[PDB]
Structure formats: C-alpha cells, structure tokens
C-alpha cells in the first residue's frame, strides 16, 4: 500500500459499504484512474473466506457489461481489490426520484443489463444483489454489473444446485426468498432486473417487500396498475413487467423469453 500511495493519489471516496469503501486512485505520472475497494477483514470472522469468494468470482469474469477486475493484494488485515474505474457513476443517479428516465434510455440500459446477466448465468454465476447502486456506467454510458460480494456459483459444469441464502436488498428480493427454503438462482436475478426496470421507468420502488402482508405488493398481485408507480409506466414496458414480476418463480419469464418481448424489441425515438 505504501509504494502504491507514493505513486497513486487516492483522490476521493467513490462509495461506502459494510466491507469498507471504494476510492478513486489516480497515478501521478500517467493520470490513469483505477477504483480501489478497501476491505477491513476484521469487520467479520467469515470475511477472509467471503472476500476470497468475491476475488475468486471476479477472476472468472470477462465481459463488456461487467466491471473489470485487475487484481488484489492483502496488507495485514486489509484487502485491496483493483477495479475498472467506471467514470459514468451509478445507474442510481441517472434515475430522477418519482420520475425515472426517458423510455429509450431505460430500454438501452435494460438490454445491457440482460447482456451482462446472460453472461454471468452462462458461466454459472448468480449476482444476488442486482439494483441501480450496483450497476455502473463507463465514459460511454455502457452499463457494467458491479459489487460481486454476494455472488455465488449455482451451476457446476452442467449441474445446477438450489440456493437457500436470504440475500440482497429486500425491495429487490424475489418472493420465493421469503416463502421457500430452497430455490432456483436464475429467477431471483430476473426478478431484481424487473425491479431495476420499474425504478428506471417510474423513479420509484413499488414495495418495501414482496409479502402478502405488504399492501403495495397485494395491489400489484391484484393488477391495480392505476396506482403508483405503475400508472406512470406505458402499457408496452408494463406488459413486460407483468411477465417478470410473477410470484411463482417457475411461471416467471426467463431471459430467452424476455428477448422475445414486444417492448424489449420496440424501436423507440
């Protein structure tokens, strides 16, 4: 860390998490910028194995819609992960509160989100924490899936396993996480993509949690799309949301069928 900081300026904090923080590092000579995730392993006993997993998963990734991993190094009880600096910031800050963003921008980001998710699923990795705060943008507004601290392997070669960890950010979690002891990985990530799409189109999350005790979730199950956030959403993207935000994960739309959706394929302004 000491020789690195002699040549690289840790200009500012980019973000904070339970792990620690992400800093913007700029080389004094070349002016190259790198995001440096700093993790204090002392914050948990499981942390060395946890960060080893995030590092291991990061080593497997190579795709245009996934944040590039350069390497890592341990300095005492501190872990340093070196990542592609995504200068467009978080997708979250492209979302105007209670408004969202223009429909063509939401469509383009959603296509890039699907490309990234198809790639992860194809190598047997599930993210488990898809949300606008974990979707970054590069200097050309290309979406990059970020933050693999909760990611895990769901398929070993051509053999799937069921997951059982109640993972992620509650307004983004699929209802089976509160109903089933074990469940398929891929429909969980599909559900969270549907929540991201809802947020991009309406600038609002539809519910605290997808429970029958949550009124807003009951309203959706009852097709009350004349209520917020749904009433702000045009019928074409809402028809896709009706297929994604399906309670039973076995009846939920799969990504190959999202790719056949009319709004997904719709040429917009």
Ligand X SMILES: NC(=O)c1ccc(N[C@H]2CCCNC2)c2cc(-c3ccccc3)[nH]c12
Annotated binding site: 14-22, 37
Residues that bind ligand X (rule: CB under 6 A) add up to a total of 18
**Beta strand 20-27 with 33-40: parallel, antiparallel or unpaired?**
antiparallel
Rounded CA gap, 103 and 218, in Å? 26
Q: Which residue is nearest to ligand X (CB)?
A: 15
Interaction residues for ligand X, span 54-73 (CB under 6 A): 67
Strand, coil or helix: 79: strand
Sign of the alpha-carbon torsion through 193, 198, 200, 203 = negative
Nearer to ligand X, 136 or 199 (CB): 136
129 is catalytic: yes
140, burial (CB in 10 Å: exposed 0-12, middle 13-18, buried 19+): exposed
Run of H or E including 60: helix 47-60
CB 168 within 8 A of CB 109: no
Verify binding: residue 138, ligand X, rule CB under 6 A.
no
Catalytic residue (choose from 7, 105, 129, 138): 129
DSSP letter (8 states) at residue 253: P
Verify binding: residue 35, ligand X, rule CB under 6 A.
yes
Which residue's structure tokens are 């923080």?
A: 21
Verify binding: residue 133, ligand X, rule CB under 6 A.
yes
Verify binding: residue 197, ligand X, rule CB under 6 A.
no
Binding segment for ligand X (CB under 6 A), chosen from 87-95, 167-175, 242-250, 253-261, is: 87-95
Verify binding: residue 86, ligand X, rule CB under 6 A.
yes
Binding segment for ligand X (CB under 6 A), chosen from 39-47, 80-88, 186-194, 253-261, is: 80-88
211, burial (CB in 10 Å: exposed 0-12, middle 13-18, buried 19+): middle
60 Cβ contact partners less than 8 Å away, ≥ 6 residues apart: 123, 125
Nearer to ligand X, 90 or 176 (CB): 90
Binding mask 92-131 for ligand X (x = CB under 6 A): ----------------------------------------
Binding test (CB under 6 A) with ligand X, winner from 147, 176, 186, 189: 147
The footprint of ligand X (CB under 6 A) covers 14-15, 17, 22, 35, 67, 83-87, 89-90, 133-134, 136, 146-147
């Amino acid at each position: 860390a000491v020789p690195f900081v002699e040549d690289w300026d840790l200009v500012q904090t980019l973000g904070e998490g339970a792990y620690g923080e992400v800093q913007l590092a700029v080389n004094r000579v070349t002016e190259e910028a790198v995001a440096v995730k700093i993790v204090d392993m002392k914050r948990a006993v499981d942390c060395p194995e946890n960060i080893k997993k995030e590092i291991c998963i990061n080593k497997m990734l190579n795709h245009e819609n996934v944040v590039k991993f350069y390497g890592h190094r341990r300095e005492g009880n501190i872990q340093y992960l070196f990542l592609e600096y995504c200068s467009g910031g978080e997708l979250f800050d492209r979302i105007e509160p209670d408004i969202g963003m223009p429909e063509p921008d939401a469509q383009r980001f959603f296509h890039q989100l699907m490309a990234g998710v198809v790639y992860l699923h194809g190598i047997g990795i599930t993210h488990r924490d898809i949300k606008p705060e974990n979707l970054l943008l590069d200097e050309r507004d290309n979406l990059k899936i970020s933050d693999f601290g909760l990611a895990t392997v769901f398929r070993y070669n051509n053999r799937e396993r069921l997951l059982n960890k109640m993972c992620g950010t509650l307004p983004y979690v699929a209802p089976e996480l509160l109903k089933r002891r074990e469940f398929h990985a891929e429909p969980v990530d599909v559900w969270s993509c549907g929540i991201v799409l809802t947020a991009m189109l309406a600038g609002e999350l539809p519910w605290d949690q997808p429970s029958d005790s949550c009124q807003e979730y009951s309203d959706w199950k009852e097709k009350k799309t004349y209520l917020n956030p749904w009433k702000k959403i045009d019928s074409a993207p809402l028809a896709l949301l009706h297929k994604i935000l399906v309670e039973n994960p076995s009846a939920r739309i799969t990504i190959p069928d999202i790719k056949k959706d009319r709004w997904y394929n719709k040429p917009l302004k």
